[PDB]
């Protein structure tokens, strides 16, 4: 246990989380928005941030606030 550690509407924050060969990749983008309802019909790509050799079998997730 405890085998790894790392440290470092008006806005939309976007992510992608994916696991390949035990490496876990996070992409991101932040933007202003003007549409009140939900995800705006437009286009803007996400850059990579993080790429971790965690080696775990991820099958579920949850969100914190």
């Amino acid at each position: 246990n405890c085998t790894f550690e790392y440290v470092s509407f008006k806005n939309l924050r976007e992510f992608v989380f994916k696991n390949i060969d035990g490496y876990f990749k996070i992409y991101s983008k932040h933007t202003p928005i003007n549409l009140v309802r939900d995800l705006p019909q437009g286009f803007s790509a996400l850059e990579p941030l993080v790429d971790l050799p965690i080696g775990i079998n991820i099958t579920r997730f949850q969100t914190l606030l």
Partner: peptide, 22 residues
């Protein structure tokens, strides 16, 4: 020595049920 033991690419799991050397 008995400390060494065994059972996707670069996957890991230490949960256990396990074999070992001598």
């Amino acid at each position: 020595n008995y400390n060494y033991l065994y059972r996707k690419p670069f996957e890991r799991d230490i949960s256990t049920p396990l074999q070992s050397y001598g």
